[PDB]
């Protein structure tokens, strides 16, 4: 359901999120790129912070307060991070 997206970063964002909120076999089996990990998993404002900060420092990306305002779903996030990178 998405190839144009940065498959390289996709593994990093997903790998960080999984361990960020510690997902189980079920959550990992019921996860998807078009699934708001914030609403679906009902992540806490604290977790989200560590998430954006983790990926931000990871790819040394420059994320703002409003930028994240439109980044809740995996696809959306990965897309925003990919658009900043070079890898297709």
Way the structure was solved? NMR
Reply yes or no on whether 65 is catalytic: no
The residue whose two tokens read 């510690």 is: 22
- Architecture category of domain 1-88 in CATH: Orthogonal Bundle (1.10)
* Nearest Cα residue to 87 out of 65, 71, 78: 78
* Angle, CA of 64, 67 and 71, to the nearest 5°: 130
Quick check: helix, strand or coil at residue 80? helix
Dihedral angle at the C-alpha atoms of 7, 13, 15, 18, nearest 10 degrees? Answer: -130
Helices 7-21 & 45-58 angle (0-180, nearest 10):
140
Quick check: helix, strand or coil at residue 87? coil
DSSP notation for 3-51: SSS-HHHHHHHHHHHHHHHT--HHHHHS--TTS-TTTTTT--HHHHHHH
Set 25, 44, 50, 87: catalytic member: 44
């Amino acid at each position: 359901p998405g190839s144009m997206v940065s498959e390289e970063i996709k593994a990093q964002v997903m790998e960080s999120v999984i361990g960020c909120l510690k997902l189980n076999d079920e959550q990992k089996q019921i996860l998807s790129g078009t699934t708001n990990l914030a609403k679906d998993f009902n992540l806490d404002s604290l977790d989200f912070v560590d998430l954006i900060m983790s990926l931000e420092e990871r790819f040394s990306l420059e994320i703002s307060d409003e930028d994240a305002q439109k980044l809740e779903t995996v696809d959306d996030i990965c897309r925003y991070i990919a658009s900043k990178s070079s890898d297709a």
